[PDB]
Amino acid sequence: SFSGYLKLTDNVYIKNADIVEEAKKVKPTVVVNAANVYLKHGGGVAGALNKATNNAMQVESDDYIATNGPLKVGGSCVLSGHNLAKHCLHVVGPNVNKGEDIQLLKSAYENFNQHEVLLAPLLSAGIFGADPIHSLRVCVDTVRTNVYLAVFDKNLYDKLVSSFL
Ligand SMILES: CC(=O)N1[C@@H]2CC[C@H]1c1cccnc1C2
Numbered sequence: 001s002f003s004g005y006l007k008l009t010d011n012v013y014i015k016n017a018d019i020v021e022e023a024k025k026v027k028p029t030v031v032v033n034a035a036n037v038y039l040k041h042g043g044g045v046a047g048a049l050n051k052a053t054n055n056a057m058q059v060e061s062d063d064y065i066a067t068n069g070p071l072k073v074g075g076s077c078v079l080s081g082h083n084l085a086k087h088c089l090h091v092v093g094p095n096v097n098k099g100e101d102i103q104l105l106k107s108a109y110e111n112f113n114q115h116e117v118l119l120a121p122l123l124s125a126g127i128f129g130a131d132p133i134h135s136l137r138v139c140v141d142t143v144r145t146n147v148y149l150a151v152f153d154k155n156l157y158d159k160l161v162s163s164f165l
Contacts, residue, residue: 002026002119002148008164012140012147016157019045019121019150020052023084028148031081032112032120033057034128035090037070039077044127053082061090073100074107089115096129105135109142117146136160 005013015022023031034045039061041050050057060079071077076091093108094100108123122139124130132151139147151157 002028005148006161008136009140011144012149014136014149014151014157014160016152016154017150018048018152019119020048020084022148022150023049023081023119024052026119027085028081028117028119029086030089030115030118031085031087032118032123033088033090034121034123034126035071035076035092036095037073037075037092039065039071039090045121049084049088052084056080056082057088074104076108076111085119089118091123093123093128093130093135096124097127102130102134105130105138106142109139112139112143112147113145115145117148119148119150121150132156132160133163136164 005015007013033049041047041058064079071092073092073094076089079088079090081088091108091111094102094104105124112118122132122135125132125135
């Protein structure tokens with residue numbers, strides 16, 4: 001069971017935590033990856049999750065792309081969670097540093113509704129360049145299933161909580 005989360009709404013919870021450490025402790029049914037369309041898990045959340053799998057996530061992902069081609073921005077795929085979770089839901093939020101449409105963030109969060117409970121980061125935050133405050137608002141207004149958000153940066157976590165409405 002998830003522990004130490006602050007309840008923001010009926011279905012959204014948040015914690016200042018490293019999502020890799022959280023996944024290793026909880027072993028959730030679903031961990032969300034902040035993926036790109038190519039499933040190239042180089043940095044940010046994706047790089048960290050992939051490193052924690054000893055690159056097994058990347059190997060699996062490369063086979064997935066070779067068979068299926070790239071994901072769409074706003075889309076997702078379900079792959080193995082390896083040693084971190086039962087499944088990994090790879091979700092592609094828009095990357096503002098690539099000029100992608102921030103309106104696709106809502107479509108990205110809609111993928112979460114296909115899973116009753118998820119451990120997730122804020123989509124499009126961090127190296128994806130979107131405002132994490134906006135990402136949290138889109139999350140709360142889009143996701144209806146139970147989502148446990150892990151925010152690594154304590155300063156950002158405090159800002160997210162203190163500005164939540
Ligand atoms: C150390 C650090 O900044 N991070 C790790 C992996 C990506 C980033 C991060 C973001 C959100 C939740 N957990 C985490 C934990």
